[PDB]
Amino acid sequence: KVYHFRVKFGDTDAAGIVFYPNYYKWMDEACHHFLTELGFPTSELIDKKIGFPIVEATCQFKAPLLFADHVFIRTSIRELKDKSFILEHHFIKQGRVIASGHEKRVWACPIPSSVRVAFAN
Amino acid sequence: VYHFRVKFGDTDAAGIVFYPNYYKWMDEACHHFLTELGFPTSELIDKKIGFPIVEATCQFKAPLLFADHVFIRTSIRELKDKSFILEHHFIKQGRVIASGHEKRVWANAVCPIPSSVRVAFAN
Amino acid sequence: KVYHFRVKFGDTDAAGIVFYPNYYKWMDEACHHFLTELGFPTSELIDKKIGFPIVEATCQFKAPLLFADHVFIRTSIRELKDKSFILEHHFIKQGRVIASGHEKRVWACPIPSSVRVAFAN
Amino acid sequence: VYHFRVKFGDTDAAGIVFYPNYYKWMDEACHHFLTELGFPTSELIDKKIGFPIVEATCQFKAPLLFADHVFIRTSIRELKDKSFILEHHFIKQGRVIASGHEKRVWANAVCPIPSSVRVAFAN
Structure with missing residues (x-):
């Protein structure tokens, strides 16, 4: 899956490039997008x-x-256990990977079947 | 008074602070204000x-x-039954370099400012 | 002009709604968008x-x-002087205005003609 | 050590802190680290x-x-000619509740860590 965004002025710092912690904000955003696009709009999940x-x-x-x-x-799902999973995230600007990383996240309890089934595409 | 330092991350490409941060800082002053008056806002959010x-x-x-x-x-300046206004003045190098206010209400569903808070504002 | 955005998870706080200072971040974003859409991509202006x-x-x-x-x-331009101008911003969710405000901004020097001409639509 | 308090605005709807803030805080620790070593980072950014x-x-x-x-x-743990790693441990209530590191380089165009900084890291 793909998540598009634009760097905002507020995302930059005085060195004139992005303030790095924002890369984790975009990963988190991508995570929510991933789950949503794959059938589970996270807003509902949050309200539960x-x-x-x-x-x-x-x-x-x-x-x-x-x-x-x-x-x-x-974004993709790389490891996938009973109560946790990993999302790999690749930042592409103009065909090129400019940064990459992952998030190991857990459920809160095990991952739900509707969720597992979804991850096995 | 609420003290704070400008973090690198509060700046932007233009070399100076991104503006909303001033609102972030007022929000922080507001919370620090109520807490020092005797009403720890972490306690309120929990409730x-x-x-x-x-x-x-x-x-x-x-x-x-x-x-x-x-x-x-921070001073309090328009206290009514259900709302109040905080005035905030940014001081750098002994001078005022920005000033604003927040109009705020009390909620739980808006409701009257609690009596204990009212009296604390009225002193 | 119109600027669309989605509330991100990170934009919320523990009270379960948006942390208010973010409304000024979205106004700033709208400001850049406004100038851009009206012919002056701000990224260039910033680099000057x-x-x-x-x-x-x-x-x-x-x-x-x-x-x-x-x-x-x-977003719109409400007052417009030699060295400054005001942008009004209206937040619409589902046909409804949920918040509104403005920014009085200045140039840095007077506003450029290409800019003035642009504002007089 | 770099002290700090969780602001309301650092939280999110789930009732707890949004995660990158931990990176924001490490960035702040890093700057506070270099400054206390004698290299005020505001001075460096200016230059x-x-x-x-x-x-x-x-x-x-x-x-x-x-x-x-x-x-x-914050401790420094992998010093080389052109890069270094900072270890950061978050302490709450006397306990470690998160820990990470930053790999950083020196730039002006990457370049060697300055000699004065090198010696300050090597002590």
Whole structure:
């Protein structure tokens, strides 16, 4: 799956490129998008008091993002256990991967079947 | 008064602070204000009690820059049964470099400011 | 002009609605969009060391925004002086105005003619 | 150590802190770290000198909540000619509730860590 976004002015810092923690905000956004596009609009899940909180995140940065860049994230599910799973996220600007990472997230309890079935595409 | 420092991450490409952060800081001053009055706002949120904004205004005189030390002076200025206004003045280097206010109400569903809070505002 | 956005999970706070300062982030985003759509992609302007910094902003909030809401901002130029101008911004969710405000911004020097001409539509 | 408090605005609808904020706080710890070593980072940014991130990792053990008092313990752990790694440990209530690191380089155009900084890291 793909998640498009534009760098906003507010996403930048005084060094003139993106303030790096924003890369995790875009991963989180991509995560919600992923679940949604795959049939589970997370807004509902959130209202049920139910989530997929992070337990581990990582990101490696190859080239800077700038104000106004159009970018997208290729997201996929890499490991998938009973109560947890990993999402890999790839930042592509203009055909090129400019950063990449993952989030190990868990359910809150095990992952629901409708969810498992969905992940096995 | 609520003290704070400008983080690198509060700046943007233009070399100066992104503006809403001023609203973030007023929100923080507001919470720090109620807490020092004796009403720890973490306690209220837990009890699903809040003081939602209805209106907010800020007037920027001079720029904040990365690493600036700043404090906000908060006073309360329009207390009514169901709403109140906080005035916030940003002080840098002993001078006012921005000033705004927040109009806020009390909610749980809006409701009257609690009596204990009312008396604390009225002193 | 119109600027669409979705409330992200990160835009919300523990009270379960939008953290209000984000409304000014969306106004700023709308401001850049406005200038762009009207012929001046701000990314270039920024690289010239040239801006339209805020001197005053205000917003009034009628109804809460929630996670996943689709929203847009109707933006317009209300006053327009030699070295400054005002942008009014209206937050519409589902036909309804849920908040409204403005930004008084200035040039940095007077507003450029290409810009003035643009504002007189 | 770098002290900080969880602001209301650092939380999200789930009642707990939005995760990247942990990266924001590490970024702040990093800057506070270099400054206390004698290299005020505001001075470096002004001179267009930086220490850009190349990689960052965080491992979340327990939740931070609104109003939590927290501090980060920063140590330096992989110093090379052109890069270094900072380890950051979040301490709440005397316990480690998250821990990560940042791999960073020195830039101006990447370049070698300055000699004065090198010696300060090597002590």
